[PDB]
Write a protein that binds this ligand. Structure first.
Ligand SMILES: Nc1ncnc2c1ncn2[C@@H]1O[C@H](COP(=O)(O)OP(=O)(O)OP(=O)(O)O)[C@@H](O)[C@H]1O
Ligand SMILES: Nc1ncnc2c1ncn2[C@@H]1O[C@H](COP(=O)(O)OP(=O)(O)O)[C@@H](O)[C@H]1O
Ligand SMILES: Nc1ncnc2c1ncn2[C@@H]1O[C@H](COP(=O)(O)OP(=O)(O)O)[C@@H](O)[C@H]1O
Lengths: 370, 369, 370
């Protein structure tokens, strides 16, 4: 009887332990309406959370509470947690221990305030905070490998060999899905479709989730898209309006492999994984090149394992078996792994009881996180 | 428990009654009653003296209470229905009257479009108010009005009266007892209103196109009946003017601004998500909206302007549908305010209390502080 | 072929033109097309149905005005062709289009269709031998004769900040809001309806624009002007009447600083400059705060610089020197700098000849100017 909540910068995948698929799957968004001197009448809420704000998105302002894995607004995150517990799962958090998923290399203030809120506000008996990559490796059915997680606000790589982590070979990159959404929004404005407000950001990310794929040979695909026009597909907005996108489809996730399009001055996800492998020990790099696991929602692009495999193949030596593992359930890998972990017979000693927080306080999380 | 008097103003006819009462108890015009007054000056006027409007509002609301409400203004709440974009000076004058001469428990300057939406029960629609002075469009989404999306046109009942006055003054065939034109320099508004309701009517879309062809090189429908007038000054209306009066109401004149075009303009400024829900929920309120064939020609004009190569590429194929309110289009907003006034739960906290106005003086309006 | 280059400084509200070297553009007029209200059937009224500038200002209550450019994007290309032809006509330049070089201005982040159609016009209708579609911020820097600086222009439809540091324009630090003078006039009309007067025509809307340009002050604290009672400075209408404006004269320019009060989502002018500086590097903000260049006609409000200083002091960190350089030629800084840039000798490589444009077309434009 454990609760597994996956709080990312985008969706908030929540459900019970032992279950295969999570119950609660909703965009973690809060939104205040356009405050004007006029009234409303016959009731309405004050701040819509979840699918409420997703359907009433035409007038409210979408404000994410988590930016790059950092909870930037604890009151909005507290509203999302209250909505999750008392409305999506329909069970109070006092009768169950919860399991939260944070990103690696996360500033300590988040990892501590999360615990302070889960104990002082909801009166939970036990809470554990695990790294999302570890849970993705749990859900991948392996104890050896590197996880190339990619969320909407964060993207990191964590190598774990035979169940042991390498806390120094863990990299992290802020170039994730939300930055791709902003880049696609800017180039769609360049093609003549101004998606200015935050309410249009959900439409442009819907375009990203539906018609954007990873190009294998980006220069060849770009030259053929500028030459031919069969690649240009159509798409309908919530209105009767219809658009056509030619380059945007494959040029949108190109920022993941080429961060120079956003001026990040960094390395792409392929070389981020390559550098994360090279920072490990020289005797366990074969297993990492074979058990490369993709996870998160930003790896759901069609035809991305081929690009990752080609780029790493060009980077890794010729005598290595480059193998990319991309399960179709990688959108919920963190939650599935949280379910597996929460349902283990050993994990009961791995919790953080209420009295432990009563004695130590917020500093016990660092000695009990991982 | 006490009731709530729902007062609704208007430049032509004021509407008033109680809370929960389906339909107002009386609909008295905005005229006054005073000795030595050949023409009663309207109560709802703008850009004029302050104290004069204070006295006019005092006497009109006083006679309104004591002649169609039969109750002292201290035992029950007052919900003053006022349309949005009403001048602040007019609202301040109403507040001064209701709190310095009558001393009501709490007023509520609630908008008109929002309660017109409350009548249907749904939380989102596009509301076209064909009032007397001007036309007004105000999109409402999830109970919140999209105030930046608005539209006004001086093509209400006043423009119809101006049209009828000029046109009937031209073809003034008042028989003797044969032409006799311009016998009187100006004709009143009562006869003009009677001509509007009893004789004028809204034409068809194809008939309107025939009138457009009749503008410059034929008026196809010719029915007419010689409208009488007291003092044996019997005039004769024409079979084409009964069509031209509505033709100017649905005229564009190379500016693309007709009564039906205003809804499409406000729909253009609305956000992408709200588009199909406002198209699926269209409400037509107002007094000018009670003309025979007005809704049919209105919807036909909307759908005729849908495939116009200026608004089609942004709207396209849409499902336009007009709702049918459970009250008359001339008095829908009042019924919405009546249902709102019959809700004594939060109205005590939603409305402006008397104590707060006496000790503060500030009136809530969409303005800073 | 070569002659004196013409700087056709376009814009959403006032299209400005004049030959290079001139320090004052002798031919400036508001950007619109005048057509009479009643559809013409014969003569004896405003003939030809085409009025621009002085002949457009000749009559107001007898015209229906249609703007050709909205938010820097050309909606009616035929109207812009007629306005450009009016610039080449017998009343504005009396010169030949196929002889003089023509400079062109555009707001940043504009769609490619605008540039392609504009070059189609300037290379098919008016076969200009030299066309260079420059920007609208770089030109203000050339006019001021300054290397560094944060150009904050505010025309009739677009307000955008482009922080250029010693000739280097940072494209990812550009903030662009589609709110300016035209929308300021629209919400000013909205507030005028609350005052008591109403306007319902395009020419009537230009009368509202005249009302805006004569008296619109920005106090540092609008609540102080709200608590007190203004003296209601009169305004003699062009029709012959008088209007006591009142509080709407200051409530209307609050849009550019607090657009959330009306119901629109944006950041505001002060936040455009602040976020444009915050998106820049950490080592350049100290110099970009002390180098602020104003431009555009919407920056001509009484007390604009004082309120902008107060808001920047609120957002920027303490003890940071701010210098909002407000030149006197703000309404013509884009044209003046365009004249300075076009008068240069290195400017020869910037344009594209007619044959050079015929070589490739759209790609030739986008490759040579960028
Ligand atoms: N089919 C798809 N193709 C491409 N991108 C997708 C697809 N489906 C979802 N996405 C993107 O993946 C992201 C989903 O984020 P994700 O599911 O990883 O949750 P999260 O909030 O990032 O938390 P976590 O990283 O822990 O899962 C969204 O930004 C969305 O734009
Ligand atoms: N039964 C009717 N049939 C047709 N038109 C009507 C009818 N009753 C009123 N009207 C018209 O409605 C107008 C009154 O509108 P009103 O509701 O007073 O506007 P406001 O919103 O300013 O109060 C009058 O000008 C009149 O022409
Ligand atoms: N003195 C002024 N006071 C108020 N507003 C002004 C003033 N001068 C210009 N404006 C506004 O600024 C606009 C002119 O800005 P400008 O930079 O010329 O625009 P564009 O670059 O689009 O031509 C006009 O449309 C007008 O609304």
């Amino acid at each position: 009887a454990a609760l597994v909540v996956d709080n990312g910068s985008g969706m908030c995948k929540a459900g019970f332990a032992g279950d295969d698929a999570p119950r609660a799957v909703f965009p973690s968004i809060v939104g205040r309406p356009r405050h004007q001197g006029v009234m409303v009448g016959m009731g309405q809420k004050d701040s819509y959370v979840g699918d409420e704000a997703q359907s009433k998105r035409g007038i409210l302002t979408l404000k994410y509470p988590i930016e790059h894995g950092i909870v930037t607004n604890w009151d909005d995150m507290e509203k999302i947690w209250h909505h999750t517990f008392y409305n999506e799962l329909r069970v109070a958090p006092e009768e169950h221990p919860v399991l939260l998923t944070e990103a690696p290399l996360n500033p300590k203030a988040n990892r501590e305030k999360m615990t302070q809120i889960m104990f002082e506000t909801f009166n939970t008996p036990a809470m554990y905070v695990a790294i999302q990559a570890v849970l993705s490796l749990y859900a991948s059915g392996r104890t050896t490998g590197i996880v190339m997680d990619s969320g909407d606000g964060v993207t990191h790589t964590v190598p774990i060999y035979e169940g042991y982590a390498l806390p120094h070979a863990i990299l992290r990159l802020d170039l994730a899905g939300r930055d791709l959404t902003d880049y696609l929004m800017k180039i769609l404005t360049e093609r003549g479709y101004s998606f200015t407000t935050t309410a249009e950001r959900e439409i442009v990310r819907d375009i990203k989730e539906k018609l954007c794929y990873v190009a294998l040979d980006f220069e060849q695909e770009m030259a053929t898209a500028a030459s031919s026009s069969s690649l240009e597909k159509s798409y309908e907005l919530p209105d009767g309006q219809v658009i056509t996108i030619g380059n945007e489809r494959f040029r949108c996730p190109e920022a993941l492999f080429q961060p120079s399009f956003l001026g990040m001055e960094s390395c792409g996800i392929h070389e981020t994984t390559f550098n994360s492998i090279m920072k490990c020990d020289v005797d366990i790099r074969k297993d990492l090149y074979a058990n490369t696991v993709l996870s998160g929602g930003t790896t759901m692009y069609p035809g991305i394992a081929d690009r990752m495999q080609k780029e790493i193949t060009a980077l890794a030596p010729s005598t290595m078996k480059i193998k990319i593992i991309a399960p179709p359930e990688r959108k919920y890998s963190v939650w599935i792994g949280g379910s597996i972990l929460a349902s283990l017979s050993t994990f009961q000693q791995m919790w953080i009881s209420k009295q432990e927080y009563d004695e130590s306080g917020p500093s016990i999380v660092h000695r009990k996180c991982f | 428990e006490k009731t709530a008097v729902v007062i609704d103003l208007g430049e032509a006819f004021t509407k008033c009654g109680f809370a929960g009462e389906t339909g107002p108890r009386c609909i008295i015009p905005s005229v006054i009653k005073k000795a030595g007054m050949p023409k009663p000056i309207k109560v709802v006027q703008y850009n004029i003296n302050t104290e004069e409007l204070y006295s006019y509002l005092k006497e009109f609301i006083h006679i309104l209470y004591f002649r169609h409400l039969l109750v002292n203004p201290r035992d029950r709440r007052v919900v003053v229905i006022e349309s949005v974009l009403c001048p602040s000076h007019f609202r301040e004058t109403l507040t001064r009257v209701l709190f310095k001469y009558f001393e009501v428990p709490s007023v509520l300057l609630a908008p008109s479009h929002l309660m017109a939406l409350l009548t249907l029960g749904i939380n989102s629609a596009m509301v076209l108010d064909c009032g007397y002075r001007e036309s007004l469009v105000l999109p409402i989404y999830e109970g919140i009005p999209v105030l930046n999306c608005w539209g006004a046109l001086p093509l209400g009942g006043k423009a119809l009266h101006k049209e009828l006055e000029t046109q009937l003054l031209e073809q003034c065939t008042v028989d003797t007892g044969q032409s006799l034109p311009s016998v009187m320099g100006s004709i009143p508004e009562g006869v003009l209103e009677d001509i509007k309701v009893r004789t004028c009517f809204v034409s068809d879309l194809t008939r309107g196109l025939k009138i457009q062809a009749a503008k410059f090189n034929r008026p196809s429908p010719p029915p007419n009946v010689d409208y009488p007038l007291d003092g044996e000054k019997i005039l004769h209306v024409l079979g084409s003017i009964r069509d031209s009066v509505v033709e100017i109401l649905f005229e564009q004149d190379n500016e693309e601004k007709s009564v039906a075009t205003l809804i499409l303009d406000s729909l253009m400024q609305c956000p992408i998500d709200t588009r199909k829900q406002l198209a699926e929920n269209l409400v037509i309120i107002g007094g000018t909206s009670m003309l025979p064939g007005f809704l049919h020609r209105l919807l036909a004009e909307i759908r005729y302007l849908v495939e116009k190569p200026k608004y089609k590429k942004t709207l396209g194929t849409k499902t336009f549908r007009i709702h049918t309110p459970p009250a008359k289009a001339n008095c829908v907003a009042w019924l919405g305010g009546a249902i709102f006034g019959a809700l004594q739960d939060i109205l005590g906290s939603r409305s402006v209390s008397k104590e707060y106005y006496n000790q503060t003086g500030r009136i809530p309006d969409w303005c800073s502080l | 072929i070569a002659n004196q280059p013409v700087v056709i400084d376009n814009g959403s509200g006032v299209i400005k033109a004049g030959f290079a070297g001139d320090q004052i553009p002798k031919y400036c007029f508001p950007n619109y097309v005048g057509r009479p209200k009643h559809v013409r059937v014969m003569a004896g009224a405003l003939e030809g149905d085409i009025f621009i500038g002085p002949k457009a200002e000749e009559h107001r209550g007898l015209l229906s005005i249609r703007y050709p450019m909205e938010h820097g994007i050309v909606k009616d290309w035929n109207d812009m062709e007629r306005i450009w032809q009016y610039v080449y006509s017998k009343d504005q330049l009396q010169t030949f289009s196929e002889e003089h070089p023509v400079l062109l201005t555009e707001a940043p982040l504009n769609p490619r269709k605008n540039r392609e159609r504009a070059a189609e016009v300037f290379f098919e209708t008016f076969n200009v031998p030299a066309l260079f579609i420059s920007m609208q911020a770089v030109l203000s820097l050339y006019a001021t004769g300054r290397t560094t600086g944060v150009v904050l222009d505010s025309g009739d439809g677009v307000t955008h900040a482009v922080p250029i540091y010693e000739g280097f324009a940072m494209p990812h630090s550009i903030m662009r809001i589609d709110i300016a003078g035209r929308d300021v006039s629209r919400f000013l009309r909205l507030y005028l309806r609350k005052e008591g007067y109403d306007f319902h025509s395009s020419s009537e809307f230009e009368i509202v624009k005249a009302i805006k340009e004569r008296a619109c002050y920005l106090s540092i604290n609008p609540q102080k002007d709200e608590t007190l009672e203004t003296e209601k400075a009169q305004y003699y209408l062009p029709d012959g009447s008088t209007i006591e404006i009142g509080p709407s004269r200051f409530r209307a320019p609050e849009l550019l600083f607090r657009p959330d009060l009306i119901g629109e989502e944006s950041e505001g002018i002060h936040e455009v400059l602040v976020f444009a500086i915050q998106k820049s590097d950490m080592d350049l903000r100290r110099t970009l705060f002390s180098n602020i260049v104003l431009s555009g006609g919407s920056t001509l409000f009484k007390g604009f610089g004082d309120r902008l200083l107060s808001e920047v002091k609120k957002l920027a960190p303490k003890d940071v020197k701010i210098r909002i350089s407000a030149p006197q030629e703000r309404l013509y800084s884009t044209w003046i700098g365009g004249s300075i840039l076009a008068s240069l000798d290195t400017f020869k490589k910037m344009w594209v000849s007619k044959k050079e444009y015929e070589e490739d077309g759209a790609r030739s434009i986008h490759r040579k100017t960028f």
